[PDB]
Design a protein around this ligand. Sequence first.
Ligand SMILES: *[C@@H]1O[C@H](CO)[C@@H](O[C@@H]2O[C@H](CO)[C@@H](O)[C@H](O)[C@H]2NC(C)=O)[C@H](O)[C@H]1NC(C)=O
Ligand SMILES: *[C@H]1O[C@H](CO)[C@@H](O)[C@H](O)[C@@H]1O
Ligand SMILES: *[C@H]1O[C@H](CO)[C@@H](O)[C@H](O)[C@@H]1O
Ligand SMILES: *[C@H]1O[C@H](CO)[C@@H](O)[C@H](O)[C@@H]1O
Ligand SMILES: *[C@H]1O[C@H](CO)[C@@H](O)[C@H](O)[C@@H]1O
Ligand SMILES: [Ca+2]
Length: 599
Amino acid sequence: SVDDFISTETPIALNNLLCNVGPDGCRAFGTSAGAVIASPSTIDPDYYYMWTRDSALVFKNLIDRFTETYDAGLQRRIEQYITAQVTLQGLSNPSGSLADGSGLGEPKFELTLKPFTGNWGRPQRDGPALRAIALIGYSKWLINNNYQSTVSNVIWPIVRNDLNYVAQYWNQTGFDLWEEVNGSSFFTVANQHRALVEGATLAATLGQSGSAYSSVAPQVLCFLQRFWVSSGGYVDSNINTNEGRTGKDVNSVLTSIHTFDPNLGCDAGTFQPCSDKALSNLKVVVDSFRSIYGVNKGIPAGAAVAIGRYAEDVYYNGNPWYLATFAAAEQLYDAIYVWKKTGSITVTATSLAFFQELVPGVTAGTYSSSSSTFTNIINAVSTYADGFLSEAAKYVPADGSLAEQFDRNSGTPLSALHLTWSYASFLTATARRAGIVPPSWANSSASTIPSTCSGASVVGSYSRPTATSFPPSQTPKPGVPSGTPYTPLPCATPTSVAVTFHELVSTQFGQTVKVAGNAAALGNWSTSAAVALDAVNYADNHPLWIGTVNLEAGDVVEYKYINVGQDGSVTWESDPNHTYTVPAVACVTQVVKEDTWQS
Ligand SMILES: *[C@@H]1O[C@H](CO)[C@@H](O[C@@H]2O[C@H](CO)[C@@H](O)[C@H](O)[C@H]2NC(C)=O)[C@H](O)[C@H]1NC(C)=O
Ligand SMILES: *[C@H]1O[C@H](CO)[C@@H](O)[C@H](O)[C@@H]1O
Ligand SMILES: *[C@H]1O[C@H](CO)[C@@H](O)[C@H](O)[C@@H]1O
Ligand SMILES: *[C@H]1O[C@H](CO)[C@@H](O)[C@H](O)[C@@H]1O
Ligand SMILES: *[C@H]1O[C@H](CO)[C@@H](O)[C@H](O)[C@@H]1O
Ligand SMILES: [Ca+2]
């Protein structure tokens, strides 16, 4: 049953989500405090980085959970995530520096909170938007619990940098959320609009000027209208480029659920889940996957299917993703929420095809909660929505782990293990089914579209934030639903820990990297018995090598990386010896030790 799946998966998803958060999460142990690894996977694929997007989406889920029920463990994690942003914002990186704002569009960082120096799809202009939305989310909590002073002191300078970035750079091309298409992206623009709306509201609450953000917001919304393909009834997810695709992409479904505000009803301007444009789009996007995946064979129209990112996808051969399949369920739960709350469903010419798939022959019109048409529709949509949950559930392993993808033919997990966003996507989709909605970000002002789009932007001021700490014990006001801090699920304490050595060193032709060390498993400083690392990952300005040795839990280890040529010659990295303490903590069975070569 779907209820069984939700029951069992919920605590596993939350646990696994939090295992990916530094400094102490079970699969992110020793990462910077507040850091969110996209995945513990270090090879095939290497996702052991911090993405501005992934971390902001994960923490928006956690901040929303924290808002529903105070949890001092979550708060500690939220505060840590926020202060890490002080460090990241200040970093010169290949996207640029903080001073002119350009550095804030950097997609990802080392989990040491250092610049990722390799070639990448940069900038990605959604990051500052999502980060702002996350930090504004916690700000509203702090303000509503009498800590506005902390917002102004610690948080606001961070949010202000990101808001200025959006207001300045929204009307320039960048890479999409899949890090592939350089242009103008639906998800990116829509969240940029949301951020400006929310940021103008926060400014005014703090007594700061929101004028720059409010003057630009409606122009961002104006431009968002250009992504709509009227002849096909769907969103072209990337414009200002010809990407060699239809533009039917879960991008647009992810947009709908992430800018959901039931107080906007079925507003099509902001692409609300129940809007006619969002529904029409959903059907088109779903349909693009119906005929092409082995796992969808023999499933009829009007029944849920496994869905991926976009039909043209070749990544790992192009497969369904858990977060995509969960996203479809979530958009439908969001629509159901609004229909139930308003007691009314409207079918239009635009949404006609979506509704006719579920209730064949239904006409456009408005149906109240008491009409049988309303009942046919809402029942069919609920079954369909649970069908998308159930479809993804079919391909979740017995242990409840959520990889990034499941195989288009066999449904077995592929790509990155324990993708943090997969867990969050499960948590949000099921929250919505439960009728738990996020805090509102908008009134109808935020949905008013100007008659013309001006492409207005504002050159902003950027300053390094300075405050890097929260006051202790910032507990809720009385009455507010409260509970004991979160505690991870129990495990055995490992006698052995898999230690992935993760080294940055530029090597020449045929050279191998080995780790020589003091412990027996590292060959007692013997160069011939040293442990060889994988040249896989070595990239332009990002020369990465990984090796995983089992070392005893609690053992203190001294090591040096050796550059071993083809000829079996050894060069030693400069002093000092590295010193690492292999952890002995419950649930910590694999760690990554991130290093750079000592010249
Ligand atoms: C910057 O903003 C302007 C206004 O929204 C965009 O210009 C429009 O682009 C669409 C799609 O290419 C055209 O169909 C419109 O005619 C343009 N409108 C106007 C008034 O010029 C522009 O695409 C935006 N650029 C970026 C990179 O975001
Ligand atoms: C955050 O970190 C900074 C270091 O940049 C300190 O100065 C501050 O006290 C806080 O701990
Ligand atoms: C790593 O650092 C330790 C200090 O904890 C030294 O004892 C060792 O020699 C290595 O440099
Ligand atoms: C890891 O931690 C241990 C003790 O906590 C030290 O002995 C070692 O130097 C390393 O820092
Ligand atoms: C070490 O083993 C534990 C338990 O199987 C995993 O949770 C962890 O990811 C690592 O592989
Ligand atoms: Ca396109």
